[PDB]
Amino acid sequence: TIVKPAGPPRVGQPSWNPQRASSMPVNRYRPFAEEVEPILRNRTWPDRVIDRAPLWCAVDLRDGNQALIDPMSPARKRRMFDLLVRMGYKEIEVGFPSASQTDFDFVREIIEQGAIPDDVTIQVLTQCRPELIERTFQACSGAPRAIVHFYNSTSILQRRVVFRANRAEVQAIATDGARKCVEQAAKYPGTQWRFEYSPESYTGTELEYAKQVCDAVGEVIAPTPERPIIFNLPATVEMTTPNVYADSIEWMSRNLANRESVILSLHPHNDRGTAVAAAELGFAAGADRIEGCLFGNGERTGNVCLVTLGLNLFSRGVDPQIDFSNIDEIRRTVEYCNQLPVHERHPYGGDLVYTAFSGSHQDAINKGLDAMKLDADAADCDVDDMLWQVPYLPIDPRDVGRTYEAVIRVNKGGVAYIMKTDHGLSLPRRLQIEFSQVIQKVSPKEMWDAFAEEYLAPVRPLERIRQHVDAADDDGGTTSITATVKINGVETEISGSGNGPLAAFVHALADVGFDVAVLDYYEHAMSAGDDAQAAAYVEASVTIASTSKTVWGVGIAPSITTASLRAVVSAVNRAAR
């Protein structure tokens, strides 16, 4: 159970701090400087602001995949690979094919099926045993180019307790691997081979030893500015604060031999919740490249989140060179592949991150939005192309395909739930959002009364009295409609044709100055039985004669056909409100 800390305060603890010593076994843990080494008074990274995208490398198919409760099926691997290509990643670690037969099979498939674009380089992980390196080259046979990423653990702790080995011995593991790579590359001249070396558990390794091993590997590989080597420096375990990782990167960047022939790569994990920070400060410290995963998947606490890194650049005016314009599509694909949810509060992608619940936040957002519109109007400009200036929202949610949501509480609650339970309507999410904004400007009765005044009651400018639907009998035929409607109270007769009743009615309305451009449509039964009422919902960008507004309409009727027509009328009248 939880025991309130009751030990004495620290000597010198201020009297305004009444905290007490816990009984947690702090004696079993040491500061980083004592655990590993003291690490740079003339650092420059604190004075550098990132002004370009790094070279990204996506490791979802390897570090991500091996961290899953359910590793990816062949379909899932391919869907993830295709997503990363489409987003614009050019280096993608496709697996560990020498250690994993399913990974071997996957690398063969993408090579043999021509799934790899000419500007994409696949990367494959291997440990250093020579038979594993041979299997690695074999997996990539026929690729036009590939990165062979080999590694071994170099940390003080692993050298002692895992290897029981001296510095020379652990270095030879790496340099023997490098020699084997050079030998294998010569055997496969139809592939442009490139190399990446990681001193694994780098953050548990003396910098001078990490440098010595990388330098020695480079001597074997013999890279040049035209054919560089990647030295990848992982926080295999995140051990300390990100400024210390950044100092370590700046030291490596300054001190590694033949720096002009090196692409310096970062591989941070998230044990202390600071991976994103480690990557950003590390990149400012001189790194060239960052490995991570979409939405921070990967071993234990995960690899650094590539989404957060990329949009942290976008939102400060730096092009990440990756497309995040539909973050929900990225999220849904990632959740399908990984079978792990993106958290409600995850930066940029989480369900709740574009929501405002506080009245004062909602008011300030509205004011920001209004002021942007006023400035756009004066500059004869599209508000969506102008400087984003809205309190509480770091980005326009529309720039990643999301929507600002002003959430209104119902005093189990919530608009969606009450509407379904009390009134039998399942509102599409975008309707819930639009309606809540209306409510914003509540008891169940107030919410219902507001819903009916908005969507169900209006009879101006458009009322639909009755209609004759002439549907062709054969599949693929035309449906035509003549409708009796009142336009601002004036009875008239409209006619249109289309591929169904909704299309026909939309076309009939166009002739009388309601342009209804349909964006979406949903319908459901409000109970069981073939004689149930149907509730229909239509989303439309609507322009009325004598600018366009995207709005929803709702229609309810015993005929599935008529319910959809009522939803169109509802939408038109909502656009006039």
Ligand X SMILES: CC(C)C[C@H](N)C(=O)O
Ligand Y SMILES: CC(C)CC(=O)C(=O)O
- In the chain, what is the straight-line distance between the N-terminal and C-terminal CA atoms, in Å? 58
Any contact of residue 63 with ligand Y (CB under 6 A)?
yes
Q: Which residues pair with 516 in a beta bridge?
A: 542
Place of tokens 């309305």: 509
> What is the radius of gyration, based on Cα positions, of the chain?
31
- Angle at which helices 501-510 and 560-575 cross, to 10°: 30
Q: Out of 78, 159, 180, 269, which residue is the one contacting ligand Y (CB under 6 A)?
A: 269
Is 276 within 8 Å of 309 (Cβ atoms)? yes
Q: Tell me which of its own copies, ligand Y, ligand X, none is bound by residue 160, counting a contact when its beta carbon lies within the kind-specific cut-off of 5 to 8 angstroms.
A: its own copies
Q: According to the annotation, is 235 in a ligand binding site?
A: no
Q: According to the annotation, is 67 in a ligand binding site?
A: no
Task: Establish how many alpha carbons lie within 13 A of residue 32's alpha carbon, considering only the half-sphere containing its beta carbon.
Answer: 17
Is 340 within 8 Å of 332 (Cβ atoms)? no
Q: According to the annotation, is 332 in a ligand binding site?
A: no
Any contact of residue 506 with its own copies (CB under 8 A)?
yes
Q: Out of 115, 216, 456, 519, which residue is the one contacting its own copies (CB under 8 A)?
A: 519
Q: Tell me which of Zn ion, ligand X, ligand Y, none is bound by residue 410, counting a contact when its beta carbon lies within the kind-specific cut-off of 5 to 8 angstroms.
A: none
Phi (first) and psi of residue 71, to 5 degrees:
-60, 160
Cα 364 to Cα 356, 360, 555: the distances in Å are 10, 6, 34
Q: According to the annotation, is 532 in a ligand binding site?
A: yes
Q: According to the annotation, is 361 in a ligand binding site?
A: no
Q: According to the annotation, is 499 in a ligand binding site?
A: yes
Q: Tell me which of Zn ion, ligand Y, its own copies, none is bound by residue 488, counting a contact when its beta carbon lies within the kind-specific cut-off of 5 to 8 angstroms.
A: none
Q: Out of 167, 429, 468, 577, which residue is the one contacting its own copies (CB under 8 A)?
A: 468
Q: Tell me which of ligand X, its own copies, ligand Y, none is bound by residue 161, counting a contact when its beta carbon lies within the kind-specific cut-off of 5 to 8 angstroms.
A: its own copies
Q: According to the annotation, is 119 in a ligand binding site?
A: no
Q: Which residues pair with 293 in a beta bridge?
A: 305
Any contact of residue 166 with its own copies (CB under 8 A)?
no
Any contact of residue 205 with ligand Y (CB under 6 A)?
no
Any contact of residue 33 with its own copies (CB under 8 A)?
yes
* Sites for ligand Y among residues 227-246 (CB under 6 A): 232, 234, 236
Strands (E) in 300-357, as ranges, are 355-356
Is the bond leading into 18 cis (omega within 30 degrees of zero)? Answer: no
Any contact of residue 449 with its own copies (CB under 8 A)?
no
Q: Tell me which of ligand Y, Zn ion, its own copies, none is bound by residue 350, counting a contact when its beta carbon lies within the kind-specific cut-off of 5 to 8 angstroms.
A: its own copies
Q: Tell me which of ligand Y, ligand X, Zn ion, none is bound by residue 200, counting a contact when its beta carbon lies within the kind-specific cut-off of 5 to 8 angstroms.
A: ligand Y
Task: Establish how many alpha carbons lie within 13 A of residue 307's alpha carbon, considering only the half-sphere containing its beta carbon.
Answer: 24
- Angle at which helices 74-87 and 327-338 cross, to 10°: 160
Cα 345 to Cα 50, 269, 355: the distances in Å are 25, 19, 10
**Closest among 320, 241, 431 to 54, alpha carbons compared:** 320
Q: According to the annotation, is 149 in a ligand binding site?
A: no
Size of site (CB under 6 A) for ligand Y: 10
Residue numbers in the known binding site for L-leucine are 499, 503, 530, 532, 558, 560
Residue numbers in the known binding site for 3-methyl-2-oxobutanoate are 62, 236, 267, 269
Interface with ligand Y (CB under 6 A): 63, 125, 151, 198, 200, 232, 234, 236, 267, 269
Residue numbers in the known binding site are 62-63, 236, 267, 269, 303, 499, 503, 530, 532, 558, 560
